RNA sequence: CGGCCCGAGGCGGCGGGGGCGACGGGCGGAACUUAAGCAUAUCAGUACGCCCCGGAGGAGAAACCAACCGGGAUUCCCCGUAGCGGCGAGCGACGCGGGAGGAGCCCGCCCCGAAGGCGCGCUGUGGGCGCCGCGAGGGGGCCCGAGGGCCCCGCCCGAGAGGGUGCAAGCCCCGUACGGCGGGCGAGUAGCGCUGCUUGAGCGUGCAGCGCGAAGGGAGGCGCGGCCCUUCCAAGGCUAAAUACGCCCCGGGACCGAUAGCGGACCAAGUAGCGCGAGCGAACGGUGAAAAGGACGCCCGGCCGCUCAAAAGACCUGAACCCGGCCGGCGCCGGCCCGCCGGCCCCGUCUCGAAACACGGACCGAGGAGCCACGCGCCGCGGCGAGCCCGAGGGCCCCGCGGCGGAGCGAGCGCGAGACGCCCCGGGCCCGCCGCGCCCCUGCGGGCGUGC
RNA sequence: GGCCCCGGGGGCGAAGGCGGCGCGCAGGCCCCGCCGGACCGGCCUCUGGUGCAGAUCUCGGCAGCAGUAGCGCUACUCCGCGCCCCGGAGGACUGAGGGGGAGACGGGUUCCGCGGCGCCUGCAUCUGGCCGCGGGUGACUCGGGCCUAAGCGGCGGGUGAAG
RNA sequence: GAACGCCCCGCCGGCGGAUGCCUCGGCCCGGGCGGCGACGAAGAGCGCGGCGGAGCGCGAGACGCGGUGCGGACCCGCCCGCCCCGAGAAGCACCGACCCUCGAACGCAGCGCGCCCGGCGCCGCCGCCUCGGCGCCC
């Protein structure tokens, strides 16, 4: 049961917030679980999906694994390499079947200066909570 | 609503019915016209509340508490009490903070099947009510009544469970649906202060027992 | 509750108990109380004698707490004595330790005489007495008294 | 609105801790024939009441007493009842882990009446033999005197 | 020729003006309507027009109320009849009592005279809540286009509020529970006379014009003159709180669900469109999980067929009225298996009387009319009972005044009920009002009687 | 608001739609087949904007009538692949108060060139004031700016509760 | 007779948009807040994008410019551009500027003209400069 009275529990307002969200909120809402192997190494549970990661898909009719070529933030979907619409011609181009990030599990992460730091920032706060508890 | 437009009757002599019409001839301003007002609009001055005397409010709580001391009326209200030691069920707990420990007591006594009865019943309701913030329904289980011990943190999350401090007992909790016989889990200090509570009501005597 | 009302039993009846010959119109007698001396005179004389006219003196501003005047009968006097003490007083019909009852403390001014008292001396202090309240009190051995 | 007012007087009480939220107000008689014999809370204390204990108006306002210089005492009992009320409060006051007093300070309480005893013989010498005639002579005294004068001038004119 | 007085033009610094569908203050000010007609009255000191502020405003520290064994500035809440009136219809305050809140002061006059804010002033200055962030825990088997489904075994819970995700998810993802930062006392006056408006204010509630014009004065719900008593000090000024409210932001709901709900759910509504103008003012929501939004071939738009679970193909479902192709047959009720026999005027309505040459109605769909608030009477049921009671307010629980009932009658001074009775009805007697024998004390007062 | 005995029915197919049996004096209810593709209830207590054939009812759709009633300004024809467009030849009309050539007012891009026929051009169209894409109006001397007409504003102030 | 019309013994098509389910919208109650303007408001006009009509936004510095923080891979089409332990796309909050014509609307007018080489409206308060009077005096 909720206790905070500045937070809506109204379906109409909650649905309006899923749409019409700004771009920084939409990125966070497109997260996925890290694999067990990365959970031990990084000590984090989920991560926001990104162009350049490798994902293992389940629960769908397009199961498989591949790299993230595109992010359709308006749709909350991601295009993976190798997961296409079944095509008509033998020659014609591939057409990506778009996957929802929560149907995925990340197997390897794209790394740069900002992604190392935001992980380390998130571990130190999760250790504040583990000291309070 | 319905009266922001401008409309007047055309009168007889033009082969049309006599209701008010907008410029152009469109029907307006009647309950039988598209876009018109209601015949008698709803108003907030409806009397929403009702009065009850203080004597009759105390009778209802006492009669609803007496129903809770029968194992045949609790059963016929809907609960599962076939594995319970006593239906006037008093239990010594004295402090409960983890839900895991509080689940262990309710099992350790025999009210485990009533909370699973409630847990496995959650569903989406049948009508328009699921657009109006009333989307799910669960059945109602035990009521824990406490006096001086922290139990609310460990009991509250359980499906179909409610919490009452003994000094202020609620009739809408004792008779869900307007049916009297709820199953009640008394803490020891709650059950042993019932008479003190009824002694704290000034110039009140309980009603006379009958056959 | 709308669902137990007489008016919902008339769906399908063309006219909801108001008749075909007469019907339901706006105000076939006028509004309010009008007509009491002309076409409702048979009603006003049968049930409201003394509705029309004037009677008596008028006071441009009445003092509500001057004209206030509470009263008590002598048959209610012994109930002002608490029950724990009444038995003993009756037991010893004393002339030299009689009970004193001051009725203004209980909020009465005048003492009237309906009823009767027990055979027991008692003293009653008030602001005014009726003539047979005094007579029945002296019949018992009691005394009346005036108080500030 | 009930929650708003309770919140306003919780904040005000911290800002004056440990002063109470109320001033000490006097005990006065409810005003009419219908309500005398019982007391209630008044507006302020008089300067004659304040002269009794030894406080000036500015001095008593400082330690929590309300002072109403517009009121005048109507009797000697009005003074003794309120001087005793002033004297008592000065005992239970400390001037600088301290206790803030709730509600009205020294509430006014009106006693339920009691029965008393006496002697029949010492109460008779208080009253005449016919009390009802005694009352009826006083009630009609002005009216009888007017009719008495009217008759007396019916004969001076009629020689 | 300088000073003072009364004016003129210019220059510098500073201030004003306009704006708002509420709440607030000041003015001007209707008619419809009701009275079963209509003039006074009512609607209403309302609509609407003009002016002026603020975050509140206005009001305010007695020329007050009262008649007490008295209260004590203003505002707001609970509570209840004096009176006004073609005395008709209607209209209508307030004190006492219970609570919220509580706060008190100044100038003029008088004393000192520039001690002051010093180009001025002696025609008088100065003193007396919002910003951050972490955030637990589910697998295996059947099946489907797709598992949030079914079967069987578990974990988290200070978190089973909820939203998303290809079909009902605590454990797939965001959140939810548990916490850190900033924090000596007023004059063209008061009053009075005449006149107009206003009020419950009644030989004047409040205001105003004009004429007159005080010294101790004002008030005490019926006028005038006299004597007392009780209680206040007008004609100058400031002041927090408790109270009211749209736009806009935030939360909630036994509310509406696309002819409903705002006129306005639709990338472009006060929009398109109409009127010289003031102004008037619509209609239109929905493919699919994914645009995968339609292959290859054959004839010269069609065919075949491709994507997809499915064309769902310009889109969900897709009723009625009405219509086209193939197949069968030639109004309601009743009997018989079946085209014969028997019965049958057009409904709704007003009306003594309708099939009427009395009126409404081509057809079909959706919408479409005794609900709510307050007051009065009677009946039923619940609780308690000479008592009863969730006022307002204060701490679905606890505490909580009036009020109504308990005694009536009388214009009023006022006086004031026991004697009977299962119940009901009647009789008799007692209380008040109107009359009258008789006796007496404290006396046009008491007692005891008689009568409508 | 409750219950629906291991916790009510549902993609192994909900609500709705179309036909067909049964049950009830009746209002109505229940089942089956086909369609449809995501939600729905039986019993107890509570609540109301709660039931249509009619109102010259309101809004929307739409039939017969019915391939019906109907389509001033003298006029076109031959050939060019040929349309009422374009060309050539013929025949006529407006008839200098013009069906001619130009301005004022009003309209506002209708002007021009190239393309085109989905809408419009009440028949047709290859035409066009229609649709798409590009373009287009040059002043010392012409008009407006200036002057005053009939008028209309302003004016220390005056008046009115104000405007 | 056939056909037309009518009924339906059934199987398919049209026209129309009811019913059912769905909802970034309304409505009701409560809580906050009470924050405009000559330092040019509210409102109106015109203009501004690489390909640009409407609406939102902005003002010739125009579909935005700067500064401090935060954030960390995108930017709906076609292009551009960014990409990295900082090199920095989307997004967010505060702060500093730019700010065409009309409007209380301010040189006159409303689109045309002046006086003067800074500029150039009305009212009021306080000061100051320069002055008038057969007002009272000298
Ligand atoms: K209107
Ligand atoms: K009509
Ligand atoms: K009509
Ligand atoms: K009660
Ligand atoms: K209760
Ligand atoms: K009737
Ligand atoms: K009749
Ligand atoms: K009438
Ligand atoms: K009438
Ligand atoms: K009458
Ligand atoms: K009279
Ligand atoms: K008026
Ligand atoms: K009127
Ligand atoms: K009239
Ligand atoms: K009238
Ligand atoms: K009148
Ligand atoms: K009137
Ligand atoms: K009348
Ligand atoms: K108080
Ligand atoms: K998922
Ligand atoms: K004077
Ligand atoms: K005067
Ligand atoms: K009046
Ligand atoms: K009168
Ligand atoms: K005069
Ligand atoms: K008097
Ligand atoms: K008066
Ligand atoms: K008077
Ligand atoms: K509409
Ligand atoms: K009729
Ligand atoms: K008729
Ligand atoms: K007739
Ligand atoms: K008929
Ligand atoms: K006929
Ligand atoms: K006929
Ligand atoms: K008729
Ligand atoms: K006729
Ligand atoms: K007819
Ligand atoms: K009388
Ligand atoms: K025809
Ligand atoms: K062309
Ligand atoms: K004036
Ligand atoms: Mg009409
Ligand atoms: Mg409507
Ligand atoms: Mg339904
Ligand atoms: Mg009938
Ligand atoms: Mg009918
Ligand atoms: Mg009638
Ligand atoms: Mg009649
Ligand atoms: Mg009728
Ligand atoms: Mg100036
Ligand atoms: Mg009206
Ligand atoms: Mg009338
Ligand atoms: Mg009438
Ligand atoms: Mg009339
Ligand atoms: Mg009035
Ligand atoms: Mg103020
Ligand atoms: Mg009047
Ligand atoms: Mg003031
Ligand atoms: Mg609508
Ligand atoms: Mg369809
Ligand atoms: Mg008639
Ligand atoms: Mg007729
Ligand atoms: Mg007709
Ligand atoms: Mg309908
Ligand atoms: Mg409803
Ligand atoms: Mg209705
Ligand atoms: Mg119909
Ligand atoms: Mg000719
Ligand atoms: Mg052209
Ligand atoms: Mg044509
Ligand atoms: Mg020229
Ligand atoms: Mg634009
Ligand atoms: Mg200008």
PDB file of N, CA, C and O (backbone and C1' of nucleotides) and ligand atoms in Angstrom, chain E residues 365-368, chain F residues 52-54 57, ligand 68:
ATOM      1  P     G E 365     -36.715   0.835 -34.984  1.00  0.00           P
ATOM      2  O5'   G E 365     -35.251   1.346 -34.636  1.00  0.00           O
ATOM      3  C5'   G E 365     -34.119   0.497 -34.725  1.00  0.00           C
ATOM      4  C4'   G E 365     -32.838   1.288 -34.724  1.00  0.00           C
ATOM      5  C3'   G E 365     -32.544   2.086 -33.463  1.00  0.00           C
ATOM      6  O3'   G E 365     -31.912   1.308 -32.464  1.00  0.00           O
ATOM      7  C1'   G E 365     -32.237   3.460 -35.369  1.00  0.00           C
ATOM      8  P     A E 366     -32.368   1.354 -30.930  1.00  0.00           P
ATOM      9  O5'   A E 366     -31.685   2.654 -30.330  1.00  0.00           O
ATOM     10  C5'   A E 366     -30.301   2.690 -30.014  1.00  0.00           C
ATOM     11  C4'   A E 366     -29.806   4.107 -29.916  1.00  0.00           C
ATOM     12  C3'   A E 366     -30.469   4.986 -28.870  1.00  0.00           C
ATOM     13  O3'   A E 366     -29.982   4.789 -27.551  1.00  0.00           O
ATOM     14  C1'   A E 366     -30.379   6.148 -30.913  1.00  0.00           C
ATOM     15  P     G E 367     -30.949   4.936 -26.276  1.00  0.00           P
ATOM     16  O5'   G E 367     -31.179   6.500 -26.117  1.00  0.00           O
ATOM     17  C5'   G E 367     -30.128   7.388 -25.778  1.00  0.00           C
ATOM     18  C4'   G E 367     -30.547   8.833 -25.908  1.00  0.00           C
ATOM     19  C3'   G E 367     -31.736   9.280 -25.071  1.00  0.00           C
ATOM     20  O3'   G E 367     -31.402   9.554 -23.721  1.00  0.00           O
ATOM     21  C1'   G E 367     -31.971  10.098 -27.275  1.00  0.00           C
ATOM     22  P     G E 368     -32.484   9.375 -22.555  1.00  0.00           P
ATOM     23  O5'   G E 368     -33.737  10.257 -22.987  1.00  0.00           O
ATOM     24  C5'   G E 368     -33.810  11.661 -22.785  1.00  0.00           C
ATOM     25  C4'   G E 368     -35.140  12.203 -23.249  1.00  0.00           C
ATOM     26  C3'   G E 368     -36.380  11.651 -22.550  1.00  0.00           C
ATOM     27  O3'   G E 368     -36.713  12.355 -21.362  1.00  0.00           O
ATOM     28  C1'   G E 368     -36.683  11.587 -24.903  1.00  0.00           C
TER      29        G E 368
ATOM     30  P     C F  52     -37.645   1.233 -23.515  1.00  0.00           P
ATOM     31  O5'   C F  52     -39.040   1.893 -23.927  1.00  0.00           O
ATOM     32  C5'   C F  52     -40.181   1.109 -24.278  1.00  0.00           C
ATOM     33  C4'   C F  52     -41.228   1.909 -25.021  1.00  0.00           C
ATOM     34  C3'   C F  52     -40.933   2.182 -26.493  1.00  0.00           C
ATOM     35  O3'   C F  52     -42.166   2.297 -27.218  1.00  0.00           O
ATOM     36  C1'   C F  52     -41.086   4.227 -25.336  1.00  0.00           C
ATOM     37  P     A F  53     -42.926   1.023 -27.839  1.00  0.00           P
ATOM     38  O5'   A F  53     -43.153   1.368 -29.377  1.00  0.00           O
ATOM     39  C5'   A F  53     -42.197   2.079 -30.156  1.00  0.00           C
ATOM     40  C4'   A F  53     -42.796   3.290 -30.832  1.00  0.00           C
ATOM     41  C3'   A F  53     -43.134   4.449 -29.910  1.00  0.00           C
ATOM     42  O3'   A F  53     -43.042   5.663 -30.648  1.00  0.00           O
ATOM     43  C1'   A F  53     -45.105   3.669 -30.915  1.00  0.00           C
ATOM     44  P     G F  54     -41.956   6.777 -30.286  1.00  0.00           P
ATOM     45  O5'   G F  54     -42.545   8.115 -30.913  1.00  0.00           O
ATOM     46  C5'   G F  54     -43.558   8.883 -30.265  1.00  0.00           C
ATOM     47  C4'   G F  54     -44.771   9.054 -31.138  1.00  0.00           C
ATOM     48  C3'   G F  54     -45.620  10.297 -30.868  1.00  0.00           C
ATOM     49  O3'   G F  54     -46.180  10.742 -32.103  1.00  0.00           O
ATOM     50  C1'   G F  54     -46.959   8.382 -30.703  1.00  0.00           C
ATOM     51  P     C F  57     -42.720  16.625 -36.369  1.00  0.00           P
ATOM     52  O5'   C F  57     -42.227  16.888 -34.891  1.00  0.00           O
ATOM     53  C5'   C F  57     -42.460  15.974 -33.843  1.00  0.00           C
ATOM     54  C4'   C F  57     -41.795  16.449 -32.584  1.00  0.00           C
ATOM     55  C3'   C F  57     -40.278  16.520 -32.642  1.00  0.00           C
ATOM     56  O3'   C F  57     -39.809  17.766 -33.112  1.00  0.00           O
ATOM     57  C1'   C F  57     -40.949  15.285 -30.741  1.00  0.00           C
TER      58        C F  57
HETATM   59 MG1  LIG H  68     -39.144   5.747 -31.898  1.00  0.00          MG
END
